[PDB]
A paper describes a structure:
The V/A ATPase from the thermophilic eubacterium Thermus thermophilus (Tth) is one of the best characterized rotary ATPases. The a-subunit is connected to the A3B3 stator in the V1 domain by two peripheral EG stalks which form a peripheral stator apparatus (A3B3E2G2a1). In addition, the dodecamer c ring composed of two transmembrane α-helices, the d-subunit and the DF shaft constitute the central rotor complex (D1F1d1c12), which rotates relative to the surrounding stator apparatus. The proton motive force generated by respiratory complexes drives proton translocation through a proton pathway made up of both the a-subunit and the c12 ring.
To overcome structural heterogeneity, we employed masked refinement with V1EGd soft mask for the hydrophilic region. The map of state1 at 4.7 Å resolution produced a well defined atomic model by MDFF, particularly in the V1 region. The three AB pairs in A3B3 adopt three different conformations known as ‘open’, ‘closed’, and ‘semi-closed’, as seen in previously reported structures of the F1 and V1 complexes. In this model, strong positive density was observed near the P-loop in two AB pairs; the ‘closed’, and ‘semi-closed’ state. A molecule of ADP fits well into each density. There is no obvious density adjacent to the β-phosphate of the fitted ADP at each region, suggesting these densities represent bound ADP and not ATP. No density is observed near the P-loop in the AB pair in the ‘open’ state. The model at a resolution of 4.7 Å for the hydrophilic region provides detailed structural information for the three nucleotide binding sites composed of the AB pairs, in the open, closed and semi-closed conformations. Thus, we conclude that the EM map presented here corresponds to the ADP inhibited state after phosphate has detached from the semi-closed site leaving ADP still bound. Our higher resolution model of state1 reveals that there are close interactions between E/160–164 of E-subunits and B/5–9 of B-subunit, where rigid β-sheet structures are formed.
Author numbering:
A (entry chain B): 194 to 386
B (entry chain C): 1 to 386
C (entry chain A): 1 to 577
D (entry chain F): 5 to 463
E (entry chain D): 121 to 359
F (entry chain G): 169 to 211
Write the structure that this text describes.
Amino acid sequence: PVQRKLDPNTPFLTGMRILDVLFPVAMGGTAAIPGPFGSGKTVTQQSLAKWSNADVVVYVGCGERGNEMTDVLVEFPELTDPKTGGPLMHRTVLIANTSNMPVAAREASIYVGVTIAEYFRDQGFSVALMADSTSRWAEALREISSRLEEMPAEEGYPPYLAARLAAFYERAGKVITLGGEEGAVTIVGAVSP
Amino acid sequence: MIQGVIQKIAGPAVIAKGMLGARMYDICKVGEEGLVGEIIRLDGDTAFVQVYEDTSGLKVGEPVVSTGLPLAVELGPGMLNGIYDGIQRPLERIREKTGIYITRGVVVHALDREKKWAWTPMVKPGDEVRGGMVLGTVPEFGFTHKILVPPDVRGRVKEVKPAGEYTVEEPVVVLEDGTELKMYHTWPVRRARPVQRKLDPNTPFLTGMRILDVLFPVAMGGTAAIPGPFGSGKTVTQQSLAKWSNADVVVYVGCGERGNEMTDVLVEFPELTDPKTGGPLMHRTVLIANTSNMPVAAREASIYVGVTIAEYFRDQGFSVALMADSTSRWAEALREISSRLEEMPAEEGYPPYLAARLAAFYERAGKVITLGGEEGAVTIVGAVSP
Amino acid sequence: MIQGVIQKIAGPAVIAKGMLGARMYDICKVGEEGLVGEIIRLDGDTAFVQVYEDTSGLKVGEPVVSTGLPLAVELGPGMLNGIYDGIQRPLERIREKTGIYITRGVVVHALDREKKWAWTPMVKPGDEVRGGMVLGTVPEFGFTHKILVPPDVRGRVKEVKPAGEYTVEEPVVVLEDGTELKMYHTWPVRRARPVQRKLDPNTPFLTGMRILDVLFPVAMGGTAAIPGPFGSGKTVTQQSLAKWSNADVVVYVGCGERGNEMTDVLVEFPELTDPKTGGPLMHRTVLIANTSNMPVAAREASIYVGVTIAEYFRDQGFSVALMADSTSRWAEALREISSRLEEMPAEEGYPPYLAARLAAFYERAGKVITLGGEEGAVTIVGAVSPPGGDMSEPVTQSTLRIVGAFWRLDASLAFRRHFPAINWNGSYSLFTSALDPWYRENVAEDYPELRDAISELLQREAGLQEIVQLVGPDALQDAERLVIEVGRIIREDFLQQNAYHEVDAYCSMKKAYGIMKMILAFYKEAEAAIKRGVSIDEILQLPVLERIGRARYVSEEEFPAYFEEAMKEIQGAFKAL
Amino acid sequence: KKEYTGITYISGPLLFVENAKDLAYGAIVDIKDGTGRVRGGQVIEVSEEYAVIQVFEETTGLDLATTSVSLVEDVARLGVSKEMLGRRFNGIGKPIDGLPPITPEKRLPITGLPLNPVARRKPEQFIQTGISTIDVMNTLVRGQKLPIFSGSGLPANEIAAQIARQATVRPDLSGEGEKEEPFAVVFAAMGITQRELSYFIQEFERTGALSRSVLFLNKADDPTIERILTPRMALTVAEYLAFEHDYHVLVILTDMTNYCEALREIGAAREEIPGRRGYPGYMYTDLATIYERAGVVEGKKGSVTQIPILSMPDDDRTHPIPDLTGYITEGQIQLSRELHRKGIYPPIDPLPSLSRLMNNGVGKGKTREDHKQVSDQLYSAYANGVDIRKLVAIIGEDALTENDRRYLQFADAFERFFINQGQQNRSIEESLQIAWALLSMLPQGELKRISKDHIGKYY
Amino acid sequence: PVARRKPEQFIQTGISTIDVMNTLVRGQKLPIFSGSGLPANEIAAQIARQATVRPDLSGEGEKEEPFAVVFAAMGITQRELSYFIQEFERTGALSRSVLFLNKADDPTIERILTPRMALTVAEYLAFEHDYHVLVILTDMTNYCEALREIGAAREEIPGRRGYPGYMYTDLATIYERAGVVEGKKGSVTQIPILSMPDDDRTHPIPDLTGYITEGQIQLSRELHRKGIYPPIDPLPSLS
Amino acid sequence: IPGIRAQIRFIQQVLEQREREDTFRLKRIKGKIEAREAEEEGG
Ligand SMILES: Nc1ncnc2c1ncn2[C@@H]1O[C@H](COP(=O)(O)OP(=O)(O)O)[C@@H](O)[C@H]1O
Ligand SMILES: Nc1ncnc2c1ncn2[C@@H]1O[C@H](COP(=O)(O)OP(=O)(O)O)[C@@H](O)[C@H]1O
């Protein structure tokens, strides 16, 4: 529970020319980015955290064809904060989960990341969640709804996919803490079909 | 009567227990304020009711009573002009006692009981009749209205009132069998009404509106559809079909079409003039309008009233145009009733016995020679919407 | 033995009660009539009777008595020149006892019990034997009809009646084992009689339809499939094999195919001559026909009997060609049980068994040495029928990727008028490399090269086809319209035979081979025609094209020289103009 | 005789009553009302403790306090007798015309039992029927179960009637008299329109062919369910007229699409599985028994040729009704909107009409020797024809060569002259004449499908 | 996840094109989408025997590491069953490989476990002794054809276009047998080759894979009709 | 292109709608099996 949503009206830096000048998102903003792979999309995700405008980085996707999910793991420690010269991993928190991993693991996955973000948020910082493989996110959902006999609907992803998907985004914007300060929760929506 | 009470309630379905020998398909008043349903399934002792009203608020334990009689319309004179809607209650009187809403469950008479009428008996006591004969004429608008003897009733005549002022209630003709052959009679909607023979069509039924007519006419009896998406003619071509004519009465039954969508029907109508005898147009209409939000199921009833009114009238010589627009509605009706009664659908959810009833609804129209040996033809012009 | 009565009868299936000790799949007799049953489910002591024929006119509390043998056709000498119901009942005798109605309550014998036969023995008594070791040779038509030990019997002989006529039932061999071999021997159907061992194939199954012999073709152990919507020649391309295959025994069996197409082969077939004797061609013929009209369950029986027959003959040593006409109905039939016994199904409602009982079937045989040391081949070319046209539908597709040699029979082809036209841009055989030895030697030493160049045009031709429909044949110039037309003729004349033209409806390789060399030439010289400076435009309208045209029609006798005449006509009729 | 009570469930056209235990699956039992009206119904699922009755009518007002069920026959059978020949009967049939009850000289099982295939005799006979398409290209034969695929606005019925009126064997390409074949008709309906009735009736009254013919009826406004008995009934009056009393009989079962409709109902109202498009999957079999009885028996006399007319929706050809018919009957001929706009009557196309039994009884002293090669040529030309109807309409208005010009020129022709036809009948010979006339226009050396002699023989 | 070590190594195949343009790296999965009748199998068994990692070019002692080809097909005909065994025995390499091959007819149940076998057996190679494995499964069309039947009986409701709901998962786990794991030096290659029926790239069975396996190497008619061999296109294809 | 496109979708949605009913129908079958055998528990 938080005490006042507040209107957006706050910039968000990312430093990337093309990012803010043309297509800002505002802090507490909420975006989404598709991007076929084999085309350099991770680049951004890296740089993202690198400059940021926040100070707490939480990156957590879940499931992604093996090897590339390991790439995150490896290149993450190598990069270093360009704001203190301190090792980057220091102000970071990663949750991973690889394809194969148990079903209802994966279903919870996002939600995890979402909560944890709120926590840190609550402490007054400004945060920066990233998540990818939202497109795959639904997957688990299908699966659970397979094993529960509830008809599908639409193409094949059960109906709740206009809600739980919803809530994942609502929780964010410019919250004001109960601690009376301000805390950033922009999510930028990777998806990829 | 027979008594019983409730077992489950589901949407507009209701089941009942405590019945035994309930007949299949009837007038079933249930609900303290009554509801007047229809018996589909008869299981055990447990009667499946149908209910044509919002079932909002019933408990469990109410009476269940029957009349041992299918749903049926009083037919006679006193028809033309007026609203009657699907379940055959003339809104007029409802409108009048109850303000501006439909307060479900109010019971009323149908065809009036107080207006007076001049009668001429046209046949003398003790003489012969077959069912379907005329006994007398009555002044009904610019019409030689006739009082048709009910079929499957016959007998000699003990007496026959002479001319005078009367209400329809009164037995005018007592049969020589001690059988008070009342003016009007009750003939359940389901079924049709026999006729001496169907006679080929060959005479045009125009409509006057050009294109529709000159190139693709229809025959005098016959049937034709109007499919069509939304957003094209449907709602108002029929209207112009009604306002011009090429036949007498117009028994028009829309179904679930909006408030304004038949508002306008009513109020403008008293101003146009018949191109057949002159005179105000209400004099040849039957209103069986039907609010969209009305009890879901009551559309199924509503169409069937219409058509049976037309035959009755047809047997009095005339040419009746019935164009109940929108059979998609009717569809929806059954589409729901199935779901309740739990039956594996067929293609897109409609129950398979669709062309079961559908077929017949289209059939009954035609041109014939009746018991009175009178020409007459009910024409039907269906509108559908996928 | 084991006996109870009807509990619940309703539909082709029944549930008896008071039963136990049953076994899965067991013949029985139900009703006072006695009808032929199958055990297909048990549930405490109640059993689902599967009832092979019709029903109607039954009461609850009537006989239900099993004997406990689970299906089997009783195989032995004398079976050709007949027809057989779904449990191998000779309709002749039936007709002789009924009139003109397939009537329930019928029992007869599989192999007639009257005829006696000229015996010959091989082994002397007081000898040893093992399973499936040949014993006696009773002659039978142009065939030599051996008799084997019934598989899985071994022992030592003790007497042998010498030559003379002898009954079918007779024990004509005694053993020191207290055992008795009689002429026939009963064998199940669900099993699958072994053989000595499994082996590769390489001999072509000739067939004489050019389209089934120059393009797609089949190994001897071949397995293939032929599909096509209704009205597509599905049946007729199996007709030809039945009268122009190249082996010992056609065993044409169709389940769910109408009378008319069956009976016809019973009035035409008498008056024709085989390519392997000279006799009435009907000797190499089975027909276990069991038309749609008949019962429900028989449609299931039917096939697996003719699979078994397919073994039975192979066994003796010959060269089985079995082909099931319209196996797909079988699926429908299987699934009709299902419905009534309540088995949830997989897609398109087929009960999940599509693979289960399919996959066992088609794998069955080819070039497999026997216990007798003979070269055994099982040749099956399965017919199927989709019910849409959507080859996407499961029962169809499951055939592919279980067997090789796929032919597809296009639908829009055939509406025009060819036969047995196929799409060769659908189709594909696998067997086509391991045929190379035999072809080289037997046919011509350069044939496979000369054929690949035909496919060179043929499959490449679409390359242009598409562009035709994108801007007409207009503005496709001349190496362009060369090909188009070449190929035009290639299907107009090298891919359309008949099954009704009086001759020209069967060919030898060497003849066909011939036709095919011509066209190549014509391509070659044409290629050098335009390059030199003249044009196809007139070349089309040369008289010599039409000679290449009508061409197929002359018969073999003339064929050499016909072909030689064009061999002159070419080189002159290019250089001139 | 006897009489049950023990009902428990009524709903739809399915009835239920207990403790019965001595009926049989497939038995006409009764449904005596507690008021005085009898109805009839089938025993289609009999268990130890309850069973299914299958009401052959609408249900109305029935109880749960009286009612009587009553075994009429164990197995359905109806009488027959060559007596009837000018009658009417409804659904099950209880003669309707106000004339007397029937007299049977047999009872016969309504199911019949399908023909032993050995008992079939090879069909062969060719008849003259008029309307080119059939009489040249596909050609009806005595015994081809053929069905005429129809749409709706297309005139389904009309075209049938000609056939009823001109069908006649040749007596001269065979050695017999004409006083060896007149004809006979057995019509049936299965739920039709009334207007379709009268049109029908008058063309039997105007040829005066009405007698010597039985026509059963069932309008589409009678009870629903009796849709599934009636077809067979008439067909069983067919075996009877065919086999022991010798006749040739063309049977019209017009419209079958109402068949499966009613069929469906029982289907799913019980619980059997669907199996494409929600028509019950065992369809194949039920639609075997209707068409499959027919044909020509061995060393016998007589003939049963069925023409029933399907009315599949739209001009689809994968709605599963006409589907399965396809395997089932041999070949078909299609009407198509395709032509109909142009006004050419009675439309047909060759393009998807097969007609299987045809290579029998043709040309061999049975038609002119030109026939075999005629058809496939003329056929294939037209195929070839409309094809360039497309390529033309894309590239230009033409850009065709002067070879190909000749093709397109024949398009309009073919359809227009030849396939159009008046009520004006034709003969086998006059037809053929015309036939060559459309082959005439293409120049020789383009007709490869015909052989050199025949071509010049009548060029 | 942490344990895994990013790939960096190389593997030759012995086929050309699938090394030059789009190169099977080491510790990698990758699959060959075949068509209906294009000849998968051959292009299989070549790449069976042929491969040998050359460590040579990178610099280090040769026989520090040996090569194990672990092979499993299924739904093989008596015919197919023999094309393998002939080729395999030919020059022989059976003596450096393991067989597993569940006949066509053979019970459908065991089918299901079948690959998982040759997968797990592969582990025991590299993790307990270091080796360099190449696992090649085949015809996973069969894998699902067969699958479905099981699920269809054991109960469930099939999801989208059949192919029982829990496919994603079930299929996933038959691919996490791959990659190198820090410290440990040996690893698994997957090449599973399968055929589509609808001849697409949209039907689920292949599509699905294409989310978890990482590339695609198709075979077209075009090549093959003109008679080449082994027809592996260029441009559709890319690791 | 934008038209024949426009056809293709039409196939998709209808091909799909086909099977919704498939399942829903099939579902009900299960319900029967379990309800039915819940009283083959008996007692
Ligand atoms: N074809 C027409 N041209 C112009 N206006 C029309 C035409 N037909 C109907 N309208 C107008 O469109 C309105 C929409 O109603 P209508 O077309 O009758 O049915 P619906 O909108 O229910 O399909 C009509 O009330 C009328 O005002
Ligand atoms: N080889 C052929 N020569 C001539 N006509 C053929 C040939 N093959 C097929 N046809 C014609 O096309 C029809 C198609 O065969 P058909 O018997 O309908 O097969 P099915 O119904 O089993 O697909 C044949 O009946 C025949 O009229």
